[PDB]
Amino acid sequence: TTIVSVRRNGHVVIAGDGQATLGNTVMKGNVKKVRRLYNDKVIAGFAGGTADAFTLFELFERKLEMHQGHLVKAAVELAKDWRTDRMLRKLEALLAVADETASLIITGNGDVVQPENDLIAIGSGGPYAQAAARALLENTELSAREIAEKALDIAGDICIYTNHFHTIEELSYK
């Protein structure tokens, strides 16, 4: 698994691989790990059970409505319920989300994190994509979509658990 997010020049994106491993065997290659939320104003991705993320994403929209779409406050309420509830505590996933305001991470420990320069990379391949995106962002003018695309192909070549099927959700705020 690998997922990436990048923000540049008024554009922010999220991208993720389609591989679903089972043991040493590939279960499914076309999984959609990236999607839009809250009237498409938000883009997000997940590493974990497809239902485990679908549940957390729905409650996150309810946290946004209570906070009128604020990204940070809705996330802390989601991470707060995640470690707290005995039902949600069984859930095991890594959530990534960004909007025009900022990108940040969420975890089943209840930790929330905004990466330096809003650069998110998660999944088993995420350290590899982070090293690739870090290089292009400093040494090239490429748009945030161009960097997240190339960084994910590299993590898929390296991580055995990541493949080259891609899904992306870009957001332009300029």
Next chain:
Amino acid sequence: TTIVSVRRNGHVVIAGDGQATLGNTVMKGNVKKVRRLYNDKVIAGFAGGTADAFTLFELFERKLEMHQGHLVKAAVELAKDWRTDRMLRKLEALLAVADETASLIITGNGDVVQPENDLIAIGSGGPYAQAAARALLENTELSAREIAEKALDIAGDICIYTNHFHTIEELSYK
């Protein structure tokens, strides 16, 4: 991870590294491991899950309000709940805290400890910073902020799990 506390000449401080390791890989370098509490009257640090410490720090403020800000009595009530509750028993972290009165440590076993000369050092690098702070305190006139800063840079050079990003919260009571 490394965290340090020092008290001298009416000044007490807490300092900690930003490294967040995952396996053999660095996850985040800028983590804020030190913060203030109870109307900024108290400074504290933590080694463990960022949510696991944020939960314990909140309840400790509630223990302070019940005890009117007493540091020692509020800590024993926190360490008492920590080992006791089945929910808190799952939490795994090392807490450090000090005010103008004294510095002391807290643990998930429920142990509370005041170091000799209120010198706290914890984390994977904490034994290294303790040996450095012990030398400067006896052989130099340096202020408590100067010793905690230099002791943490040494532990970061030594401990692979500690880095040189720093956060400090000083308290002056003179």
